[PDB]
Structures are given as structure tokens and as C-alpha cells.
Design a protein around this ligand. Structure first.
Ligand SMILES: O=C(O)[C@]1(O)C=C(F)[C@@H](O)[C@H](O)C1
Ligand SMILES: O=C(O)[C@]1(O)C=C(F)[C@@H](O)[C@H](O)C1
Ligand SMILES: O=C(O)[C@]1(O)C=C(F)[C@@H](O)[C@H](O)C1
Ligand SMILES: O=C(O)[C@]1(O)C=C(F)[C@@H](O)[C@H](O)C1
Ligand SMILES: O=C(O)[C@]1(O)C=C(F)[C@@H](O)[C@H](O)C1
Ligand SMILES: O=C(O)[C@]1(O)C=C(F)[C@@H](O)[C@H](O)C1
Ligand SMILES: O=C(O)[C@]1(O)C=C(F)[C@@H](O)[C@H](O)C1
Ligand SMILES: O=C(O)[C@]1(O)C=C(F)[C@@H](O)[C@H](O)C1
Ligand SMILES: O=C(O)[C@]1(O)C=C(F)[C@@H](O)[C@H](O)C1
Ligand SMILES: O=C(O)[C@]1(O)C=C(F)[C@@H](O)[C@H](O)C1
Ligand SMILES: O=C(O)[C@]1(O)C=C(F)[C@@H](O)[C@H](O)C1
Ligand SMILES: O=C(O)[C@]1(O)C=C(F)[C@@H](O)[C@H](O)C1
Lengths: 150, 150, 150, 150, 150, 150, 150, 150, 150, 150, 150, 150
């Protein structure tokens, strides 16, 4: 139990999000990942906190980073992307974050897409889930962490 | 296409929400519906808008109100509650609101509850879905409408 | 057992159909509910009968009206709309209309839409089911009632 | 926690039951709803209590009545009829009645009927469930509430 | 795009319909296939058209006839009978009739029979579907073609 | 067709019920099987009848006893316990008791437990089913038999 | 209702059976279709009857031959082969044979093979079904027809 | 590998068959179990063999008897009745009878009854399965064993 | 076991393919069946073989042709079209072609179309399956047969 | 809570295991049940305990023995065999053994066999489950009981 | 949109394919991955192109390579091996390769193997799918890319 | 085929197990991974062997390590953790270890947890599976490998 003041918010991004804003804009929009990071920096600063913003295409690396967050961060905002639908491993890693606030974010409204995107393993552990609010959902995520970590 | 300045945001609440803050606090919290309304009034005022906040236990009345919103409001934030899981009628009413922003909100994280709560008919039409962020999710809802209606 | 001459045909319309001809024309067409009523009045008059045309967004009100029909009308043409897919209540009300001819009508061809529209509880009781014949299906409905009530 | 002496037993009846004893007697029998009420009044009086017997075809009205029962009655005997199979809303309304005894009754043996009648949302919350004991089941219901409220 | 005046309506009947009116009258009635043809000839004549009425027990022959209709007829009224539930081939044949009006007709109400009759491949392509209106459904079918071909 | 006066009510209890009142009291209560027998003896005597109360852990023995009931008893109150969910054999045995009233009883509310307990083969044949009314359900069972055997 | 003496037993064989005894002997054996016919002729003669033995690879032709049997034969022994699992059309043709005895035969034990062979449409109408008794099952078939036609 | 001459055929009957010919004649007929035994004794004698005919309502006893047959009989004709649908234990016992001919018999045509009767564990092991040929199916059973044991 | 030199490659085409290149070009392309035949003739000639190219809309006729191939051809390239999804009969016919190479071809990528097109009975027997390579897939088919027959 | 020193370990074996080592060796091996007992006696003696080894083919008898264990033994190693997959009765008996260590053993690796063997009712209650370790699994079972009873 | 002349074809191989030709030859054959590369190099050279042939056991590394291909290669031939069945992440990476030809290849015929191998996430995006043509499938893959990239 | 004396036992641990003994002790216990390693070292030494103990959060790395085991180790004891439920890749890597003994271990009893943990891909290949025996299951594993490798 670190506060926004003692430790950053870890913002994790799963596979293919490195290409945000360069494909399927109608689905993901035209902002890049760097735009999202900046949005997150600003949203956190307004509460007196900071962020640690990461993206990986590797499941295992996401898991390693969650383990790091348990010791060094005050909450996790995660867009696990494709692994949302397939990774029991990320679910179990988050389950080890006892007491740590987790908010799941999806840019697109997964409930309107293919049936296999309707389910998310992460949602079983996440305190909150935001879907289809575009990149603004990331801000919502930071804000909810601020309120819970508070 | 009314703006936050020309027309209020309709905030609809479904069945049993009149008892918010008086039962199952661990699930729904201890804020009342009146507390929620005030949060929404405040969030909207910051963007220069107003709200029209209603609650009903009757599916058909929620439908009538959605029809009204099509003509007189700039967006809908809706917590359909139990009707989320059963009402094709509310989905079809929302489907007539062509171009109108709709955000679905749930206080609890439905994905951690009984399987029949996992599915929502509204999610197929909603631009955004926020679940398990407590009453704070209503604020996110207002905020997303402001940005969309903008 | 009233005849077309002793009692009107009750035409019941379920939710959202009050907006017929103002949205999703490619699906529902551009005729209004008033245009449909007129079609029904004409079709019935050719057989010497009349109609009692109603629309509601409330499941329970549709049930009440079915009860009324049992005593005072010669048959029912019903477009239960969304409730087609959810209402066991309307099915059971129609099951009390022993001997009364019922025809179910759907403007759109439900079998080509979302899977949850594929099933109708009313179809289990209805004598006939007409789908995807546009508003002309209402005429077919009145005609079948005329032949059965005859 | 009101006793049979401080408050009546609310007996709720759902849709189409107003026609009890006038159709499908082989299924529902030939007693009317008024006959049932009388049975209930008698059963309760033997234990020193009273009843408040209601029937509605409207889901939302049943919900309102359940809310009223939480504040003013000592238990609920409910035959939700068709809404047994479809209403998550009634379930959640009953879930707010913390500590209040609920007994679910069905005149017919739903397990021998159509598959969609096999499931009941209410059963998940009801303390007891009686099916296929005819209208005598209502008496069993009053009796169990007397023993639990005791 | 032929009109009712330039080309007949093809009426296709699938397997076992050659025995119409000689078995299971309670299901299919006591009119024969020849009686149906006469009804269709009359309904079409009222609009200034003609019909080409055929029956076969062979899937492939139905398919051949559908091919013929694309070049020579103004619409198809089809009762595919058993092949309704099993023939992807007839579906695909109809899918080649781009722009040609197709109405699917069932004498019995399939939705009240065995579960395997509840689904029809043809319903995915057909403009309209009529079920359980007895042989009168064929007249409806001719009438809808007349209005679409018009 | 023996009456309560010519023949006893057979009360059958399935496996593990010999341990009633010694484990999982919160589920099954703290009354023992002997306590239940006494309740039954009393309920029956009030109507002028007697009971033959048995318990077995063997499926085939329960079947044997059902066959004996066909010839010598006036009705059966059965709590098949675990065999409720697995024994087609008991169902068929009961299906041979033509005209004999059968009431199924469960102490716990099976609908609230593991999904495999949600279904009962016996319910298909039983006239009435009582669940979740504790050992009082046995009295309800005796009483219904009295009214039916009457 | 023709007797074994007035009319032959029609023995129908579905697709690929023309190759019996030339492939997959371990499954279908090494007797040919001609061997089977001879077994059938002998089995029927012992009861004073005759057979009309046919094979086709065409569904519709099997349907035409069933129609013929209704007028001219005393019963049907049918091995529909692959069509067993797919042909609603053969089912409906047999359903028109009111009062005619039908026995379904399979050489192999279909219940031990692929799951799609586990189901047969014909079994819903057939009076008797024999599977896995090799070609001897045809004799069983003839015999049962003799006994029923008797 | 005993022959019909060295060892009897064991004919096993499952639960409730002791009441054959005294209930549901339309389903099971009016012959008794003794009548069936006599049929079997006769069929077997014609091939020079004998039978050992048993009935039990206990699964475990059927199992024990199957073990005995492995050492002392030349084949098994079995009608497992309700245990057909539930007993993996009988299947596994039959799976220990390496090389021994087993024929499964059902008097009724299970494929026309309740869905839970459609499946039989025994069918996976049985060489042949005869269903719906009435008690005559037992004779077919004896006859197949004679040909296989030969 | 005939070689490309002793016997032709049979190329079979199922229903509706006679219309290739005249409808749904975006799905099937604009080449005609005659174009495909020419591609096949060329591909085979390069390896020293010939082809026998056929199309039918009749399931049973495809079956007959497969039988012929077993005796007279060196392999089969087959596009069963709609029958891919429904014909157990074609599968079983192919199963009699022991040792004969079979390659299944689909012009469109069935895995991207309607769910009922995702499954093919032929795929269980075919040595190779080619889907969504347009008409070029037929050449891949000829080439694989050449390499296997070699 | 008896210790290995105060009470034996009950080793229960379900149906058909009396034939261990005489059939399907590749599956169950060639050791007999007597060989397993000796392995269990030895494993237990090393910890200072004893065993009470039993086998039955009767579900109810297994249940009775479980009841006996609750009072007189220190843990249960059970191989329910076929009943693993069907017996809710054995599960509930084990559920009465509050605090008593249970280990489930399977000789074969059920997860590689037929789908119906994949599931076990006992596994829900068992502390530990061992599958596919041959007879050695029984030793692992004794060992775990020793460590838990310790 | 690079041509075969401007950019190589990327050939990706998923997990365990580094062991090709050293295990399960009957399934995968005896050619090695180096043998496959050589076939690919030759097939491409005939069209004037080159290949970039890679193998990895890491999902994320496949994803990275697909990203690279979007910028630097003219098409992708991919055998995702096990990830075919589990990786939404590879699917989404391919989905970013707008306009890039993709062909999926499987050496074995997956439709004849375990059910979990029947489905592939890649098949939803791949232009073409080749299965069960052995390593020759890779050649087909290069050839199709050549024709599409052309 | 290396013996315990020629080569170590590879013990593989999947994701999140690095945190063993620091979270969810009631599920996984309070021993650490280092404690487990020491148990394994000891169990193996008693049979004259050694162990090579590894843990990774990366699927691909586990696969690489399995490849290494094929050439250098005498067996594999694996706890794939979350990848148990999702990784077809690990299954296939194990499938390449022809003849190598594999034991699957799970500390918790997965059959009592969430439904998605009930299935394991590794169980299809593993010689033995041990679940819910705590960290003692690793010792069982080493022992079974010793006996098989022997
Ligand atoms: O941000 C999203 O909308 C998502 O998490 C991202 C992806 F890339 C997809 O794999 C998910 O389905 C949705
Ligand atoms: O806000 C919620 O958590 C919810 O919408 C409200 C209800 F009342 C429930 O019926 C929903 O399942 C959740
Ligand atoms: O007429 C119709 O097409 C329909 O009944 C009307 C509605 F509004 C929908 O809810 C139904 O799905 C279809
Ligand atoms: O009392 C009953 O049997 C029931 O609750 C009443 C109805 F009206 C039906 O809708 C229910 O399925 C059963
Ligand atoms: O006209 C009909 O009702 C039907 O199309 C005809 C048949 F012959 C049956 O096969 C169909 O299921 C219904
Ligand atoms: O009385 C009961 O609640 C029950 O019939 C008894 C048992 F023992 C369980 O096996 C049933 O599931 C419920
Ligand atoms: O006779 C048989 O065993 C069968 O009817 C014949 C065939 F050819 C198969 O298609 C059936 O599945 C079984
Ligand atoms: O012979 C029979 O039809 C049967 O095997 C006998 C019984 F008693 C039933 O339980 C089986 O379903 C059918
Ligand atoms: O070539 C094809 O894509 C196909 O086999 C042909 C048809 F006509 C369709 O029926 C198949 O589903 C696909
Ligand atoms: O020990 C076994 O492998 C088993 O428990 C024994 C039997 F006999 C089978 O019924 C089980 O499926 C497996
Ligand atoms: O080439 C194949 O057949 C496959 O892609 C390769 C593997 F390694 C398997 O995992 C796939 O299921 C099939
Ligand atoms: O050791 C176990 O119990 C487990 O394999 C370990 C994990 F980490 C989970 O992911 C598995 O479901 C269980």
C-alpha cells in the first residue's frame, strides 16, 4: 500500500498497441501510444502522482512487469489487448497483487466485436473495467486508481 | 445533435437503484442515489451542461424516457440494472437514437458476479461501457458524453 | 367465438413501433404506424369487419389488452416486437385465449438478424407467423384471421 | 424482523393469475384467485397472522411491492408466474429483503412442462420452493413463513 | 428484373408435397397440391400474372429449377419442405438469384413441431417467410411477389 | 387406490440421510431422521393415517421398496437424496405406480447449490415437489398425499 | 394393410451399399449386396412372403420408392445408410406410411463410430431398429415385419 | 470361448423388468418376464443351447453376474433397462469380457422417448443392439449370439 | 494404384458451380468453370497426365462418379461445394476409395464465412484441403495429386 | 481426528477392480488387487500404521463403508472406479467426513480416455487426486494420508 | 505494396517446427526445416523473388516479425503451428498488415486430428489456407503470394 | 533413454510460481520454490539421481527447455501452472519427447477451482498427473520418474 505520492502508477499495454494510431483508426482512433502516455502523465500529475508506461508483445514479460508492480507501484492500469482473451497467466499474476488496485482498459468496445473478444480473463480480478471510451478510458483508469489508492 | 449547452444529459437508472446505499454496501457502496445525482450535476456543470436524472423500476417507462431523450437531450448515461441482462426492448429503443452518445454504467463489476450478469444487451449499442468503478463510473460517463457531444 | 361481424380484430403492436417510419427504414420501411393502421382498416373492411389498433411499450399492458381481447374481439394480429424474444408473459396470456385465432407478424425478417431475434415465444402459440413481408404482413395477418374466424 | 403478529404476510401473484380457475383447469385447477386468498387468510389466522394478497401483470409493480414488503411485512409468499423465468429484476428486489423469509410457490409442476419453465430466477433467493401442490401450495407457503418468522 | 407481366412466378414445392391432402390433414390440411396450384393461378391472375407450379422430391432438381428461374421468371415462392432444414445447396442456389424476390412458405407452423424443424437455411435469403397459414400462405406469397416485382 | 385409512404412506429416504442432524446442520439442520419420522407420524395421524418410514443407501433397494408401495401403500413421500440427480431407475419405478400420489421432498434448496443438484429425475413424475422448507417439507408432503388420496 | 401374402416386403438400401463386401470388411463384412438379397428372399419365403430389394445412391429416389411402398408393399426394411444421419426427407416420407411397419437396419454398430453417425432421423419413425448384427440384421428385419404384418 | 453346446447364454435383465406385462403395455407389451424367458429357452434350444435367465434391480449385482458370465457362459443378451443410461460400471464390466459376444436389447424404441434415454453406455461395447422390436428382440438376441458363438 | 500416365485425374465440382464467374465475383471470382477446366488441363499436362472434369448439382450423381473413379482414375480433386457441409454420403463414398489420393478444394475461404460453412465432412478423409486460393487452388490440387500418385 | 497410530487407513476400491491384473494390462497393468494391498500394507507400515483394504461392486456398500470410516479410520484412499463418474452418492458420503483426509486414486490416466471418464464427482471433495501413476499411485495415496494425518 | 521483386516473402514458422523431420514423420514427414527452406527458395526464385525464412517458439517474437513484415516484405506464408489454435495476438498482428497477402500453411491435415486443432484464429484473416499437403504446401503458399503480389 | 544415473530429472515450473509461499498460502502453502527444489533434490538422491530445477514465466522458454530435456534428461516433472490451461505449444513440445517419462504436477486441486482450470492440455500426454497433494506432489513426481526411468 503505496500512495500516488510514494510510487508511480504502472500503465501496461499488451500486444500490437505499439502500432496505435497507424491502423484501424475507426476502431482504435488516430492517437499514438505516445499521445496516450502524455495523456496519462497529465491525468496523474493532477493528483500529484506519476506514471510508468510500458508496452510489450510478450505475455511473459507482462507477467514479469506485474510482479515488479507488486513491490514498486501504487496501482495498475492495464490494456492487455489480445492476451485479455487468452492469458490465464496474466490473471494469476494480477491475483498475486493483493490489495493493489487494478483497472482494465480497452479502447474499443469489445462487446460489439467478434464473440471471442467478449470474454476477458482479467475482468475477473480487475476492480474496474472500462471499454470503448477511446483513449480517454486511460484517463478514467488513472483517475480511478487515484481514488482507490487515496 | 444537441450540445451540452443546448440540452441536458439524461441519466437513467433502472430497477432497484432507488435503494442504493441501503443494502449490499460491499457491492453497491453506501452512497445514495441522491449522492449520485449530485456527483453528476457537478461533473456536468464543469463542462457547462446540465442533467436530467431519473430512476424507474418499469422497463416500458425506461423505454418512453429513451424516446424522449432522442428529441430533447444531448446524450444518455444509463445504468439499466437488471434490465441490462434481459431487455431487448431497451436495446431497440437505444438503437433508434441514431447519432446520440450513449454510455452504459454499472457500479458493481458484473464480470465477477453470477454468469447471467455477464451479458448485457445494452453493451451492443453503447459507445462506452464502464463497470465496477463504483459511483465514480457515473462521472466517467458524464465526462465521456461531454467529449463526444463536443 | 365471435365473428368478424360481431367483434373487431385486435391489432397489437409492441415496443418502439410508435417510431415506425422514422428510423432504420431499410429495416422497417418508411411507412408510419398510422399508415399501417389504415392498411389494416381497409383489409378488414373488405371482409366486413373492423379493427382495434393499439401500441404499447409495456409488457404488462400488452397482457392486459390480450385479456380484453379474449372477451371482446374475434382474433389477434400481434407484432410483439422486442417482447417476442423475451416475454413468457405474453405467451401465457395468449395461451388463455382458447380457440381465438392469433397471427404473429414481424415487419423485418428476423431470421436474418442477430441470433437473439431468431427465437420467438409467441410463435409457439400463434396459429400463423408472418415475417419479413414489410407492413404488407399486417394485411396477411388480417386476412388469415378473416378466414379462420369465418 | 417483524413477527406474524406485528405485520402481515405479503402474498404476491404475477401475470395471468387473475384468470385462475377459468382456463387450463387440468393445469391450474378450478379454484379462483379469490378462493386462494381465502385459503391464505385462514391458514394465517390459525397462527395469529394476516395477509396482504396482491396480483399484478406488471413486472415493475411487483418490484415496487417487494420494496414495500421490506418495510412493512413479515415475509413473502410469491408466485411470480411467467416472470419466474425471465425477471432478474424481481430476483434483485428480493435480494434487498435481507433477513426476510421468502417462499416461492407454483401451482403446476414446472419441471414437467416446457424446458423454459424449468428454470426460476427466484429460486436462487427463496428460502423454500413449492411446486405442483396446486393451490394447497400457498398454504404450505404461509405455514413455512409462520415457522420462520416465529 | 422481369415484371409479373413479362414472366411467370415460379412456385416450387419440395419433397413429399405430392401427397398433400392425403395424410396428416390436421397438420397439412385436406387440400391437394392441385388445389394449391389453382389458388395460386387465381391469386396471380388478379395481378395480371401467371405461374409455373412445380414439385420435386430431388434436391438437385430443385436447384436446377432455381437456376432456370433466374433467367426466366419474375420471383419464387418456395416451400422447400424437408430440404428447408438440411439443404445448403438450395440456399446457395437462391443466393445466385440476385435481385429476384423470394418468399418461403410453410403450410404447418414449424415452430411448434420438432426442434430440427425450427431452423431453415432458406430463411437466411428469403425476403419473406410465411408459416402456419395453411395453403393460404401460398396466396400471401404470390401477393408479396406481386408487390415486390411491381 | 387405497385411502389413508386402508394403507400407510410410505416415506422413503435416500442415501446419507441416516446421518441427518449430525453434519452440515446449516444445510440440513440439527434434527435427526428419528425426529423426522416422529413429525411424519404426527402429521399423518391428524388425518387418520399411518406411515411406513424407511431409509436406504442402496438404489436397488429403494426401487424394491417402490414396487412394494404399489401394492400396499396409499402414496409416497420421497427424498431420494443423491439419487435424485442420477437415478433413472427410481424414476421408472415410480412410473409404474400408476395413479399413486408421489411427493418429492428436499430438505435443502437444491437450486442454490451446485449445478448438478439443480436437476432431478424424480421431478418429472412427482405430483409435487418441495424444496428448502427444512424437515417441515416432509409434513407438507404428508399433507398433500392426504389431500390427494382423499 | 396388406399381408405378407398379398404384397412383398420392400427392402431399401441407401448410398454406397452397392459396394458391400468389397471394402472395409471388418466394418461391413465380406458378403455382397446380392448375398444379402438372397438372405432376404429365404427369410421371407419361410413366412410365405416375397421381397422387392432395391438400392440407390439418390435421396429423392429413396423417397419415391417409399411412396410406392405405401400403396404396394406390406412393410419396409430400410438401411438408409448415410442418409440415416442427414435426411429429414426420408423421415417425412416414412411418416406418410401410416400403419405400415418399418424396421431400420444398420450392418455396423453405429454407436461405436463417429459421433455424427450416432443419430438417425429414421429411428424416430421406425418401429424397430437393429444395429451391429451384420447382414443377419436384415433377417431380423424381415422377421419383425412378418410378425407385425401378421 | 465356449460354444452354445458347452455353456449357456446368460440373459440379463435390469431394473423394473420384474414388472413386465403389468404396466405401460402400450410401451412394453403385455407379455411377462416369464413369457420372455420361455421365448428365449425355445430360441436357444433350436440351436442346441440353453439359457440362464436373470433379473435384478441392483447395479452391482448385474456387475457380479457379468463377471460370472465371463467364466461360465457363451454370450450375454442384456437389457440393462434404466442402467443403460447411467451405468458406466456395467459398461466396464462388459469390457472385461474379452471375446465374449454381447447383444443389447431394448423392448421399446428408446429413440422415440425422452432424450435421456437416447444414449446408452452399453452400446459402446455391445456387438449388436436391438431396439423396439418388442420381446421378439430377445429372440433376435439369442439368434445373434448363436451365430457368433458358432 | 494407377499413375498419372495410366488414368486421368477426376475433378469433381458440386452444386451451383456451373454458374461460376457469373455471380458473387468478389467471393468466387470472374473466371468460369470452363476457365477452370482449362487451367486443370494445363497443370496436368505438364506432368504427363489428363483430367476428367465434371460438375453436378446432384449428391447421388457425385457419389456415382466417385465410385467410377475408384476403378478408373488416379486421384480426385473435389470441390463439393454446398455438399461439403451436409453430405455424409460423399464422405462415405470417398472412404471406399482406399489408397486413392483425394484433395478437397474451396475457391472461397470458408473459414471467414457463415459458421455452417466452417465444417466439412470431406475434410475428414481428404489427404489435403485447399481453401481461399481462388481457382488457383484447383492447380494446387492437381499438383498434389501428381506428387502423391507419383 | 485419529492418527495413523490409533486407526487404520481405509483403502476403498470400486467396481470391477476385483479383476485387476487379469484384463487390459496395458491399461491397468498386470498386478492384482492382492499385489496392491501388499503395497499399501508396506507403505503404511513404514509410517507406523495399518490399512483396511476393501473392494466392492456396489455403490451403496461403498457408501456404508465411508460412514464406517468416519468413526473408525484415520483417512481414506479411494479408487471409486466407474462410480467416480456417476456417483453423487459417494461424493456426499465423503462430504460427511469432516476433517478426514481423502485421496482419490486412478491407476489409468483418465484424461486420456473417453470424455465421460474425464470428470469425477469425488475430485470436488478429495484433498488430493492421483491419476495414471499405475498401482504406485496407491502408495502416493498412503503417503499423503500419512503426512496429513500427522 | 511491394512486389516479389522489391521485397522478399517472409515465411514464418511457429513452435516446435525446429524439430521437423525428427519426430512423428507419419504426421509431419521426414523432411527438415532446412529442406523446407530450400523448397521455398526455389519456388520463389522461379518467380523472380526471394524469401526470408524464420522459426520461433515465442509468440511475441512472431508478433514482432509480423510487424516487420508490414514494412519490409511483399507477403507472408505462415505456419503458426500450435499458436494457430490459441493466439489472438498473431491474428491481430496480421490484421494490421492491411493489403498484405497472407497464406496460412499446415503440414498435417488438422481436420483429422484432435478437435482443438480444428480451429485456427489465423484462418479468419488469411487470404488462403492450405492444410495436409505436406511440405509441398509451403510451395503452394509461395505460389499464391506470387500471384497476389503480382 | 537415459537412466536416473546418466542424466538429471528436469523439473519445470511455469508462471507465477516464483512467488510460491508468499501469497494465497491456503491454496499454495507457505513453502517457497527453494523449499520445493530442496525436496526434489532429496527425493532424487535417494534413488541415485539428480535434478535440474527451473522456473519461467515465458511459454516459449518452457518449450525451449523441453527441447533441451529430450536430449539431456531422463524425465520431466512439470507444473505448467497457468499454461496448463492454455498452451497447446507445451503439449506439442512434450509430444516430441518420445519415450521420455513425463509427470504433471499441480499443488492445488484444480478440480475444485474455477472451471477453466479443470482442463489441462498437458494431461493428454503426461504419463501421470498429480493434483492437490501440496508440494509433496513434486516428490511423488520424482518417484514416479525414478520407477519409469528404471
Ligand atoms: O484496447 C482494446 O480495444 C483491446 O484491448 C486491444 C486489442 F488489440 C484487442 O486484441 C482487444 O480485443 C481489445
Ligand atoms: O450498477 C450495477 O452494478 C447493476 O447495473 C445494477 C443492478 F442492479 C444489477 O441488476 C446489475 O446486475 C448490476
Ligand atoms: O416487426 C419486427 O420486425 C419486430 O417484431 C420489431 C422489433 F422492434 C424488434 O424488436 C423485433 O426483433 C422485430
Ligand atoms: O403457478 C404456476 O404453475 C406458475 O407460476 C404460473 C404460471 F402462470 C406460469 O407462467 C409459470 O410457469 C408457472
Ligand atoms: O409446408 C410445410 O409445413 C413444410 O415445409 C413441409 C414439410 F413437408 C416439412 O418437411 C417441413 O418441416 C414443413
Ligand atoms: O434433502 C436434500 O436437500 C437432498 O435431497 C439430500 C441430499 F443428500 C443431497 O444428495 C440432495 O442433493 C439434496
Ligand atoms: O449399414 C450401416 O452400418 C450403415 O447404415 C451404412 C452406412 F453406409 C453408413 O453411412 C451408416 O452410417 C451405417
Ligand atoms: O427394454 C426397454 O425399452 C428398456 O431397456 C427398459 C427400461 F425399463 C427403460 O429404463 C429403458 O429406457 C428401456
Ligand atoms: O468453392 C467454394 O468456396 C465452396 O466449396 C463452394 C460453394 F458453393 C459453397 O457452398 C461452399 O461453402 C464453398
Ligand atoms: O483406476 C482407474 O483407472 C479407474 O478409476 C478404474 C476404472 F475401473 C474406471 O472405471 C475408471 O474410469 C478408472
Ligand atoms: O503444420 C502443422 O500441421 C501444424 O501447423 C503444426 C503443429 F505443430 C501443430 O501444432 C498444428 O496443430 C498443425
Ligand atoms: O500448481 C498449481 O496448483 C497450478 O498449476 C499453478 C498455477 F499457477 C495455476 O495457474 C494452475 O491453475 C494451478
Amino acid at each position: 500500500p503505496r500512495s500516488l505520492a510514494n510510487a508511480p502508477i504502472m500503465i501496461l499495454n499488451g500486444p500490437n498497441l505499439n502500432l496505435l494510431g497507424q491502423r484501424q483508426p475507426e476502431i482504435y482512433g488516430s492517437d499514438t501510444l505516445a499521445d496516450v502516455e502524455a495523456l496519462c502523465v497529465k491525468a496523474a500529475a493532477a493528483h500529484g502522482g506519476t506514471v510508468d508506461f510500458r508496452q510489450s508483445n510478450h505475455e511473459g514479460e507482462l507477467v514479469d512487469w506485474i510482479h515488479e508492480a507488486r513491490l514498486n507501484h501504487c496501482g495498475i492500469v492495464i490494456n492487455p489487448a489480445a492476451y485479455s482473451h487468452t492469458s490465464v497467466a496474466i490473471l494469476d499474476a494480477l491475483n498475486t497483487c493483493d490489495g493493489l488496485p487494478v483497472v482494465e482498459v480497452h479502447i474499443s468496445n469489445i462487446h460489439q466485436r467478434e464473440p471471442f473478444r467478449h470474454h476477458s480473463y482479467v475482468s475477473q480480478r480487475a476492480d474496474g473495467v472500462v471499454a470503448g471510451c477511446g483513449v480517454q478510458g486511460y484517463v478514467f483508469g488513472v483517475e480511478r486508481i487515484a481514488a482507490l489508492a487515496g
